[PDB]
Every structure is written in structure tokens, then in C-alpha cells.
């Protein structure tokens, strides 16, 4: 799809000529805002002392929190 005033929607990144918008890969990478990123950002995975509060989506990175012992 086409960029809007140079920008691609959340959950997308821009192509290598600045002309096209490409969807992030669900569960793999993300893009939170209207952007001119050349790729989506890789999702964070929680480290062992942490629980996943919400999963990575194309528009939102993983949210991790310590288990019963913050923080």
C-alpha cells in the first residue's frame, strides 16, 4: 500500500524507495507509529525471570514483567 505524506501506518515499514508500505510479521517484528522505518523492529522476548503480560503484535512490542518478585 501507498505511504501517507511520506509515512507508513503502525504495523508497517516503508520500502527501499520510499514508495510502498509493507506489513510487519505478526509475532516477529513490530512498528508502533506512522513511520519511515526500512524494516520492522524485532520483538523483545522476556528473560527467564519475567512473564509475558501481552504478546508482540505488529503494532506493539512484547510487554514483560517480573514474576511475583518485582522488579
Amino acid at each position, epitope marked *: 500500500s501507498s505511504p501517507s505524506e511520506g509515512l507508513c501506518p503502525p504495523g508497517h515499514h*516503508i*520500502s*527501499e*524507495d*520510499g*514508495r510502498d508500505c509493507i506489513s510487519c510479521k505478526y509475532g516477529q517484528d513490530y512498528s508502533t507509529h506512522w*513511520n*519511515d*522505518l*526500512l*524494516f*520492522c*523492529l*524485532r520483538c523483545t522476548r522476556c528473560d527467564s525471570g519475567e512473564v509475558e503480560l501481552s504478546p508482540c503484535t505488529t503494532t506493539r512490542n512484547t510487554v514483560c514483567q517480573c514474576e511475583e518478585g518485582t522488579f
Partner: antibody
Amino acid sequence: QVQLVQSGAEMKKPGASVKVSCKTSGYTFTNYKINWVRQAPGQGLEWMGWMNPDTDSTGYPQKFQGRVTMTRNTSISTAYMELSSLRSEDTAVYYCARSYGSGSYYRDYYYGMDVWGQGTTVTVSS
Amino acid sequence: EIVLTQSPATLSLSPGERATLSCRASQSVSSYLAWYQQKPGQAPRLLIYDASNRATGIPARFSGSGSGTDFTLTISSLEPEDFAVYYCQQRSNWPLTFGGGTKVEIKR
């Protein structure tokens, strides 16, 4: 012996165009992007855009759309940059430089602009 | 466009002294920042890619660090051949851009 060898210095009149060539050897030409970068006298580096020699896809900063064309001839492993409607301000050394990673490999497999041509001086004047 | 600010523009240091060069991006570029060196009348030369990875052929006294908006090129001890101009470069956002450069010159 990975090398990028550029064409010689050029003089141009305002309004003309210049075509600089960048001949590569020592690797598979089709496997790396070519970038063009210029430097006016006593100034910084300015990126001009890039080309995927494999698919012939290009992209240029908005400031250079219309004026910059990147082409390649795969059979001779050389990339070209053509700059049209030249002005005084286009007087610069022009460099080509390869970089690895395109499309779905660009984010994760990029190792910088690792080998550069020697540069081509272009003087624009009447 | 991402604006890369290299400040100060000139750094005056002695041979055998530590150098710390600053590159600041107008907005986060995560780890997608490269460093180049250029001596007068020579092509630029890659030093560091993706913020902290030293390139082949580059001596261990060069190292990059930082992420987001604040990046540092450190030269642990200046050698005569290290006095040159240094440029940072971001690759995360369209279009790719360079910083305006920092010249490291010899203090005497």
C-alpha cells in the same frame, strides 16, 4: 581483492549531465547493493541513494528524484550513476560503495558500506 | 529525515590520548548506526557497523557504543594516523543520512 574502480575526473557545463561508472570485481556483483555518496569541497558526505543490482530496484532521497538515475550492467559488473541538470553546487567527489543486505535480509544482514570506490571528481562550471 | 548531530565539530587532542566522539540522532535509530573515517583526499573507510561491531581490518582501539539516540565512537589511545574526520550514518529510516562529521586534530 574486492575492488570498486570508478571512471576518471570530469568537467561539465551547467545544465549538462554526467554519468559516473563503478566497476566491481572480486565478488558476485549481484549480491550487494551499490550506494552513491558525494562530497562537495570542504563539506560532509551526502548519500545520494542506492541500487539493488540483482533486481534493478533503486531509491533516491526526495531532494534528488528526477536528477539521479542509478543503472547497472551485470554482464560487466559495473554500476552507473547519472546526474542531470548539473549546477555549480554539484561540484564534488562522487563515491560508490557496496553494502550487503536487501529486502528481507536488510535488517539482520548488513555489515556497513565496507568497500568504496576511489571517487570521481566532477567539476561543474562554464 | 533522521538528523545526526556530531558535536563538537572539532576535537583537539594529543597523540596517546583517549578520544570520545558523539553522534546524536533526532529520534531513536536503535542500533542502526555506522561509523566512517576519512583522511583528506581519501575515500571514507568503514569503522563500526550497527553501533558496536568493529569492521574487518580496523584496529581494536576503535569501538562504538550506544543505542537509541546517543552513540559514541571511542578511540582508546590516538595514533598519528587517527587524526581525521569521522562520520556517523543511520540505516534504519528512509532515506539513509550521515552526520556532519567531527574532525579530530592534534593539540599542541
